[PDB]
């Protein structure tokens, strides 16, 4: 917006865990206002993570997002006759949004019985990085060096 | 909204209203479960005796000032494009513009 007066609302309504990132992930996985459905699906996924993963699931969650967040992002700018791309450092707030969106959209595309164990599967895969979300993250990362020439 | 057409719907109004009782009795006897097939059939014949121009389905209500077949409001008696004209002058009691 040209005016830049649009402030942001603050949401923090963690039911039991009392965290922050969890609720934003809730909103990301919430579809068509099905908040309770998102509750039960993500909590079943986290239960599977907790039974599979020895440690608590929240630090595993944040470590998984640590391996999906892209450090730099490429963005096309047209020089006026040619279609270029420019690498830029990602906004610190934007990193979490990209992390959450990528993780959800990649957990959606597994194809197994439900997306609770899909979310668990990519949560453990992203915990060190053998998933597909990390594949897209590293591809986008390497595009920056592929286009480091312009940068400025 | 030709005046002949208004005349021929007003005459339909009289023709419908002027019986007003044989329809009710015949249809009530027909719909009565215990009346025998003879009183079913004679009632059917009686219903088919009278002119078709007697039912309420044939009666298409119209604006009382223009007779426009479309755009009717039965709470009033006026059409779509006379109710507004009368309302803006304040003739219709207790009618204003609504915002809420």
């Amino acid at each position: 917006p040209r005016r830049r007066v649009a402030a942001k609302r603050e949401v923090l309504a963690d039911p039991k865990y009392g965290s922050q990132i969890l609720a934003k992930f809730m909103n990301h996985v919430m579809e068509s206002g099905k908040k309770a459905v998102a509750e039960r699906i993500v909590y079943g996924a986290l239960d599977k993570v907790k039974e599979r993963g020895k440690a608590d699931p929240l630090e595993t969650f944040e470590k998984a997002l640590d391996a999906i967040a892209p450090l730099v992002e490429v963005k096309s700018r047209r020089v006026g006759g040619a279609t270029y791309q420019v690498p830029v450092e990602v906004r610190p707030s934007r990193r979490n949004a990209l992390a959450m969106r990528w993780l959800v959209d990649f957990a959606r595309k597994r194809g197994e019985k439900s997306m609770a164990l899909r979310l668990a599967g990519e949560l453990l895969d992203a915990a060190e990085g053998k998933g597909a979300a990390v594949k897209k993250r590293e591809d986008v990362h390497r595009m920056a060096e592929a286009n480091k020439a312009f940068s400025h | 909204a030709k005046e002949s057409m208004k005349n021929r719907e007003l005459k339909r109004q009289l023709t419908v209203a002027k019986y007003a009782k044989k329809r009710a009795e015949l249809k009530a006897i027909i719909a009565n479960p215990n009346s025998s097939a003879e009183e079913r059939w004679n009632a059917q014949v009686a219903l088919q005796k009278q002119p078709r121009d007697a039912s309420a389905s044939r009666l298409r209500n119209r604006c009382r000032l223009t007779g426009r077949p479309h755009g009717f409001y039965r709470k009033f008696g006026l059409s779509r494009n006379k109710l507004r004209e009368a309302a803006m002058r304040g003739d219709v009691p207790g009618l204003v513009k609504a915002s809420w």
Binding site: - | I30, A31, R40, Q44, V45, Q48
Partner: protein
């Protein structure tokens, strides 16, 4: 369709022109305009000229059309074909 509370429906003058007809065998088609009337097995073999919009198409009734109305055996839209 019409409920079981009412079995038949026939134009009354049609009923009188068919019931009087059966006193002698089929000798002439009967001219009719009411496409709505039912047909029972009691005018089987009679030929009825039902109005179609511009002409009275004659159709010979048989026993195998008790449950179909007069108008079903008369088409009002031509559609000879696009080309």
């Amino acid at each position: 369709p019409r409920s079981l509370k009412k079995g038949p429906f026939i134009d009354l003058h049609l009923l009188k022109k068919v019931e009087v007809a059966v006193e002698k065998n089929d000798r002439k088609p009967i001219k009719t305009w009411s496409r709505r009337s039912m047909i029972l097995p009691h005018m089987v073999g009679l030929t009825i000229a039902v109005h179609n919009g511009r002409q009275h198409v004659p159709v010979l009734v048989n026993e195998d059309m008790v449950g179909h109305k007069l108008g079903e055996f008369a088409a009002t839209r031509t559609y000879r074909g696009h080309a």
